[PDB]
Amino acid sequence: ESNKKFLPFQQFGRDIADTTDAVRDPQTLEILDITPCSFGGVSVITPGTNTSNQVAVLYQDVNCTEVNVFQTRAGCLIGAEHVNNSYECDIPIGAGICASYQTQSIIAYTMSLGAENSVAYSNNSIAIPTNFTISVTTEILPVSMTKTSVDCTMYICGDSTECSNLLLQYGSFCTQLNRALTGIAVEQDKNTQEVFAQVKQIYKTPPIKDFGGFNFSQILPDPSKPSKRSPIEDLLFNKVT
Amino acid sequence: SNLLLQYGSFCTQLNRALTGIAVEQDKNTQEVFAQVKQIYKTPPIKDFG
Amino acid sequence: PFPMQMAYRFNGIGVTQNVLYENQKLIANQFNSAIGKIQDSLSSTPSALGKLQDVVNQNAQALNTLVKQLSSNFGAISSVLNDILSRLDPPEAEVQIDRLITGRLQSLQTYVTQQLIRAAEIRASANLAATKMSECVLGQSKRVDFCGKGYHLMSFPQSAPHGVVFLHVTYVPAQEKNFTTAPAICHDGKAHFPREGVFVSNGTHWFVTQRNFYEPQIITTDNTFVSGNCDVVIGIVNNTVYDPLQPELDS
Amino acid sequence: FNGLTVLPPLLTDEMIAQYTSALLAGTITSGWTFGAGPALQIPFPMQMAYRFNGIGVTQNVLYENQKLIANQFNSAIGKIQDSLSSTPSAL
Amino acid sequence: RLITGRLQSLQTYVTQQLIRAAEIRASANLAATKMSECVLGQSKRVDFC
Numbered sequence: 280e281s282n283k284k285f286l287p288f289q290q291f292g293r294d295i296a297d298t299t300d301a302v303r304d305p306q307t308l309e310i311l312d313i314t315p316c317s318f319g320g321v322s323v324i325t326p327g328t329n330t331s332n333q334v335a336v337l338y339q340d341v342n343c344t345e346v347n348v349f350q351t352r353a354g355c356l357i358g359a360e361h362v363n364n365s366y367e368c369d370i371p372i373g374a375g376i377c378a379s380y381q382t383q384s385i386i387a388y389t390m391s392l393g394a395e396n397s398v399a400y401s402n403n404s405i406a407i408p409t410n411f412t413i414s415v416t417t418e419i420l421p422v423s424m425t426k427t428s429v430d431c432t433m434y435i436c437g438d439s440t441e442c443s444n445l446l447l448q449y450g451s452f453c454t455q456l457n458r459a460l461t462g463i464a465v466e467q468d469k470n471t472q473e474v475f476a477q478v479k480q481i482y483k484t485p486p487i488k489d490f491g492g493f494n495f496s497q498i499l500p501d502p503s504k505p506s507k508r509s510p511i512e513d514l515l516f517n518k519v520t
Numbered sequence: 521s522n523l524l525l526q527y528g529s530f531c532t533q534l535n536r537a538l539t540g541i542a543v544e545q546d547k548n549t550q551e552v553f554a555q556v557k558q559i560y561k562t563p564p565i566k567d568f569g
Numbered sequence: 570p571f572p573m574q575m576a577y578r579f580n581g582i583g584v585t586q587n588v589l590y591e592n593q594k595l596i597a598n599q600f601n602s603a604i605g606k607i608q609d610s611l612s613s614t615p616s617a618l619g620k621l622q623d624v625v626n627q628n629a630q631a632l633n634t635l636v637k638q639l640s641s642n643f644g645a646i647s648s649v650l651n652d653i654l655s656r657l658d659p660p661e662a663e664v665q666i667d668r669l670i671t672g673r674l675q676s677l678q679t680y681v682t683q684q685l686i687r688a689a690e691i692r693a694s695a696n697l698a699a700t701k702m703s704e705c706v707l708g709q710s711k712r713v714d715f716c717g718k719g720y721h722l723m724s725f726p727q728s729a730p731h732g733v734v735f736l737h738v739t740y741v742p743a744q745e746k747n748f749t750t751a752p753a754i755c756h757d758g759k760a761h762f763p764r765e766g767v768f769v770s771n772g773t774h775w776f777v778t779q780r781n782f783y784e785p786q787i788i789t790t791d792n793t794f795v796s797g798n799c800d801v802v803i804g805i806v807n808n809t810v811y812d813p814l815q816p817e818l819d820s
Numbered sequence: 821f822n823g824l825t826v827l828p829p830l831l832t833d834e835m836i837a838q839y840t841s842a843l844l845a846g847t848i849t850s851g852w853t854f855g856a857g858p859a860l861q862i863p864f865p866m867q868m869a870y871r872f873n874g875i876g877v878t879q880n881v882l883y884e885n886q887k888l889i890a891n892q893f894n895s896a897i898g899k900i901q902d903s904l905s906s907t908p909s910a911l
Numbered sequence: 912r913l914i915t916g917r918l919q920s921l922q923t924y925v926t927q928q929l930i931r932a933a934e935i936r937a938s939a940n941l942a943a944t945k946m947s948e949c950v951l952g953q954s955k956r957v958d959f960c
């Protein structure tokens with residue numbers, strides 16, 4: 280039942296997107312609003328199957344009354360127990376709510392932004408470091424792709440002459456497809472050259488690795504192995520497949 | 521739906537792309553704002569000279 | 570010499586080179602231990618190379634979907650071109666062949682467009698990597714958090730499959746102690762400011778130390794300069810400023 | 821409503837504001853140190869003099885003009901406040 | 912016919928959204944850099960901040 284104020288001649292309303300939003304009963308002057316039957320996506324929250332087989336189901340953009348039962352701003356959450364605590368976000372659910380597997384069952388909580396701190400600020404106090412540490416961190420950056428070429432003559436038509444004749448009527452779609460793919464392929468080699476080929480000459484470390492105690496054995500190339508890669512490089516090439 | 525199933529995996533591609541964009545949005549926000557490790561608080565006495 | 574180069578790096582980040590020369594064994598041990606722990610960190614956690622693995626996976630998925638798009642009818646009678654060729658005469662099978670051609674061409678165009686977008690993303694990543702090489706490996710960058718979290722000393726490139734790995738060596742202060750500080754001290758009605766450090770007090774005496782390391786020194790006229798009088802600086806304190814020339818004149 | 825739905829962002833506006841406040845407090849109470857390691861407290865005029873030293877101006881210039889600098893900073897922040905309150909096309 | 916038209920429109924929307932998301936990712940990377948190099952430190956890059 281709707282309170283939309285139709286004019287006495289109007290029969291059915293519409294929204295801003297040109298969708299039938301209301302109708303008038305042919306046998307009664309009553310005004311009926313039309314609302315789509317409740318729908319939404321279904322998201323399943325789970326830890327690894329090696330950990331546990333228990334899962335939680337998130338029904339998106341629907342209240343729990345239209346479907347242990349927690350109502351989040353991201354939808355209705357079923358199977359996860361709300362917890363007053365707060366930890367780091369393990370499984371992002373949304374709207375500040377995360378989930379994790381802890382002592383065991385799945386729990387739902389508000390994510391913790393970090394550890395509270397208050398620097399002891401006054402107007403005549405300073406903190407000065409009496410020591411230090413040397414920190415080495417790792418950064419990984421993709422540099423290139425695999426160069427792929429696709430031929431229409433064999434892809435679209437499987438060695439069929441009639442199909443090739445009919446495809447010839449479409450102009451130069453495939454010529455420019457091949458042109459774009461070749462551009463990408465050349466671009467990848469340009470990427471690699473720009474990154475690595477930044478050195479004019481091939482410099483060599485001295486045969487005596489006397490650098491004042493600093494030891495670069497893990498990053499310098501390994502001569503014993505048939506592949507002249509450092510142990511770290513060997514790990515990197517073994518891990519990535 | 522039955523006639524649309526004959527067009528292949530267009531839905532899979534489109535939904536995957538949209539989901540990737542949605543995840544990338546949160547990645548962007550985390551990169552911009554979550555740079556700090558601890559939640560620092562200004563002292564109650566606002567004597568900053 | 571490498572210790573002298575690392576002392577230059579320490580000067581770059583704001584620490585005097587004597588801090589390095591007097592801690593050379595400790596710094597070398599810390600560097601060796603960190604390099605050793607890099608191997609454990611990379612081996613134990615396989616999610617660090619997730620960037621390269623995800624690039625490979627995305628390209629493989631795109632190719633696999635492109636191949637699987639060949640088994641779709643696209644509204645035609647059958648996906649196999651030979652089947653539709655043999656089953657029906659050309660003048661009627663032409664429309665079905667056209668439907669298949671349109672579907673396959675659209676799939677190829679979609680794959681190509683996704684490839685261009687992903688290639689632009691990879692080119693952005695490669696430009697970032699080239700900039701990192703130039704500014705962190707072939708130099709010492711003062712840009713914050715550009716070559717690791719901390720104060721950048723140096724970084725080492727390592728090749729990876731379709732990628733690059735940077736080992737960012739940084740200086741991180743470790744053990745802090747609170748002191749009492751003053752903006753300036755005035756000795757004979759003249760305000761003295763620290764020339765390249767900060768004034769600190771351990772409770773009774775006043776020293777001048779470098780800002781990034783607690784290495785206190787006696788306040789003299791060689792590490793301070795005179796500007797103005799006692800009446801301008803807010804928070805000025807009283808102290809004696811040593812004059813090395815006075816004992817020379819006395820003796 | 822045609823299969824077109826919007827997923828809420830993972831970090832709420834309150835959490836973004838909390839990050840921003842943490843960054844502000846760290847900058848004001850510890851300078852640039854907190855972004856490089858442990859946060860080391862320092863009086864704000866002293867780190868302002870550090871910034872002046874970093875742009876090529878001696879510390880005495882800031883210490884002997886501290887009140888003028890503070891007044892200029894406050895006036896500039898107020899002017900930004902007013903400009904944001906006035907012009908709607910800035911964003 | 913309706914399926915073909917609607918699928919084409921959806922594909923166009925998704926492609927343009929991917930381009931827009933790439934632009935927004937570039938902007939967010941710039942914003943993260945600005946945070947790191949001007950809130951967490953003093954920058955000597957001219958007109959960067």
Ligand SMILES: *[C@@H]1O[C@H](CO)[C@@H](O[C@@H]2O[C@H](CO)[C@@H](O)[C@H](O)[C@H]2NC(C)=O)[C@H](O)[C@H]1NC(C)=O
Pocket residue numbers: 409410411412595598599
């Ligand atoms: C600065 O920190 C280092 C740690 O990196 C300290 O060196 C350690 O000293 C203890 C002595 O109690 C030894 O047992 C450790 O083996 C040392 N570690 C290393 C890696 O050598 C150093 O002593 C600290 N500096 C000061 C002045 O205390």
Ligand SMILES: *[C@@H]1O[C@H](CO)[C@@H](O[C@@H]2O[C@H](CO)[C@@H](O)[C@H](O)[C@H]2NC(C)=O)[C@H](O)[C@H]1NC(C)=O
Pocket residue numbers: 488494495496497
């Ligand atoms: C540089 O570090 C490597 C460790 O990666 C050292 O190699 C170790 O040498 C000791 C003694 O020779 C052995 O007990 C270890 O098993 C070796 N480890 C590895 C991984 O090979 C190497 O000796 C160091 N360089 C110098 C000059 O001391």
Ligand SMILES: *[C@@H]1O[C@H](CO)[C@@H](O[C@@H]2O[C@H](CO)[C@@H](O)[C@H](O)[C@H]2NC(C)=O)[C@H](O)[C@H]1NC(C)=O
Pocket residue numbers: 771772773774
């Ligand atoms: C602050 O540092 C000074 C160093 O100049 C300390 O003075 C010395 O203290 C030791 C005690 O450990 C005495 O043996 C020396 O004779 C003192 N020398 C001078 C010149 O005073 C002072 O004690 C320190 N104050 C505090 C509170 O630690």
Ligand SMILES: *[C@@H]1O[C@H](CO)[C@@H](O[C@@H]2O[C@H](CO)[C@@H](O)[C@H](O)[C@H]2NC(C)=O)[C@H](O)[C@H]1NC(C)=O
Pocket residue numbers: 805806807
């Ligand atoms: C630093 O020393 C000077 C001189 O000893 C102090 O100046 C005195 O200030 C008081 C307070 O107004 C006056 O009553 C004295 O007459 C001043 N002395 C002289 C010789 O003029 C100054 O106060 C000291 N610094 C601080 C922070 O107290």
Ligand SMILES: *[C@@H]1O[C@H](CO)[C@@H](O[C@@H]2O[C@H](CO)[C@@H](O)[C@H](O)[C@H]2NC(C)=O)[C@H](O)[C@H]1NC(C)=O
Pocket residue numbers: 888891892
């Ligand atoms: C430097 O410029 C500042 C303005 O930013 C001057 O301060 C002003 O001085 C006038 C006097 O003519 C006062 O009416 C204003 O109230 C002051 N403004 C502030 C914010 O304090 C300052 O005098 C100038 N100094 C020199 C040496 O030229």
Ligand SMILES: *[C@@H]1O[C@H](CO)[C@@H](O)[C@H](O)[C@H]1NC(C)=O
Pocket residue numbers: 305306307
């Ligand atoms: C139509 O007929 C039904 C039953 O015969 C009656 O209830 C209803 O009021 C009628 N409506 C009109 C507009 O005549």
Ligand SMILES: *[C@@H]1O[C@H](CO)[C@@H](O)[C@H](O)[C@H]1NC(C)=O
Pocket residue numbers: 342343344345350
């Ligand atoms: C609860 O369900 C009603 C519909 O029955 C809906 O209007 C309301 O928004 C839901 N509550 C929340 C918090 O979303």
Ligand SMILES: *[C@@H]1O[C@H](CO)[C@@H](O)[C@H](O)[C@H]1NC(C)=O
Pocket residue numbers: 402403567569803804805
């Ligand atoms: C610091 O604050 C105290 C009281 O809060 C005050 O007595 C002192 O003068 C102040 N010093 C400076 C340099 O601001």
